[PDB]
Design a protein around this ligand. Structure first.
Ligand SMILES: COc1ccc2[nH]c(C(=O)N3CCN(C(=O)C4CCN(c5nc(C)cc(C(=O)NCc6ccccc6)n5)CC4)CC3)cc2c1OC
Length: 277
């Protein structure tokens, strides 16, 4: 199944064959979310999923890019991601080009920025933190946590999610170990988007643009209620292609919407497979 952090969805032929598609995992999820997408793609299309690793967005691309080079050498590279997955796809695209590699397609599946830019002041930190606590107060019962006022600052990424365990567990609630792990990696991963700096990219990038964020994203950060037509990428990508697919961010990876993604996407993998001559 899984070698290191690389999941095989469809192995590439012993010899020759088409170009593999590299997909990257979403926050709190594995790359089997790309199985519908793979269904809507040309037949013997290889597909390989990059699973979670630790670090900032830049730290994670430094582990992925060597593995990409081991698998695909100089190119051509097809890089596809949904949600956080597209941010990971973009970083790897940057990193591969900086080493002179041939990246010919970057597919962003509604990897869309909050319309207006998210402030990173004290007051907004406190604020988005309450809206995170709000989730834990409805989901795991426990309407009785507490808000810190300077504890938040001094703690790091891990200390912060560790701090919410100490709070919920002393209510008397036993969160199952598997649920704790999942919430923890969802936190670290969404936090790595928080701090990431986008770099400019002069290659082709396709944004598959749904039309709205689902409800619990707006609950955490209401700036996700509005979207720009470019998704926040227009400043950084000269050759940006926006493809409509409608629906909500959470639906974009699924049937039926994924069918519009993969129909277009097959209209590029055909172009690439051609331009291999
Ligand atoms: C120029 O800059 C640009 C340009 C273009 C860009 N595109 C993107 C992009 O592709 N994506 C991926 C899809 N996205 C999400 O899925 C959201 C992620 C946060 N969110 C949430 N929702 C819940 C329910 C929980 C959490 C969470 O736990 N947060 C951690 C945290 C931090 C602090 C306090 C408390 C918790 N987060 C709602 C969904 C948005 C980001 C980014 C980006 C960009 O900036 C880097």
């Amino acid at each position: 199944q899984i070698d290191g952090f690389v999941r095989t969805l469809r192995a590439r032929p012993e010899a020759g064959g088409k170009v593999p598609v590299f997909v990257f995992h979403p926050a709190g999820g594995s790359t089997v979310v790309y199985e519908p997408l793979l269904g809507r793609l040309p037949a013997d299309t290889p597909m390989y999923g990059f699973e979670r690793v630790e670090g900032s967005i830049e730290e994670r691309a430094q582990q992925y890019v060597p593995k990409l080079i081991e698998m695909q050498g100089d190119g051509p590279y097809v890089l596809v991601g949904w949600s956080l997955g597209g941010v990971l796809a973009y970083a790897c695209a940057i990193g591969l080009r900086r080493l002179g590699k041939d990246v010919r397609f970057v597919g962003l599946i509604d990897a869309v920025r909050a319309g207006e830019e998210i402030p990173q002041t004290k007051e907004e930190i406190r604020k988005r933190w309450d809206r995170y606590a709000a989730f834990a107060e409805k989901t795991f019962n426990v309407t009785i946590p507490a808000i810190p006022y300077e504890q938040l600052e001094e703690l790091d990424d891990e200390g912060q999610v560790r701090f919410v365990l100490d709070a919920v567990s002393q209510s008397g609630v036993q969160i199952p170990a598997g649920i704790i792990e999942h919430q923890r990696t969802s936190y670290l991963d969404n936090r790595a988007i928080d701090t990431a700096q986008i770099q400019p990219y002069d290659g082709h990038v396709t944004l598959y643009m749904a039309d709205r964020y689902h409800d619990d994203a707006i609950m955490f950060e209401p700036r996700y209620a509005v979207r720009q037509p470019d998704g926040g990428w227009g400043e950084y990508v000269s050759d940006l292609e926006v493809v409509p697919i409608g629906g909500e961010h959470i639906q974009a990876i699924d049937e039926p919407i994924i069918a519009k993604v993969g129909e277009h996407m097959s209209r590029a993998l055909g172009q690439i497979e051609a331009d291999r001559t």
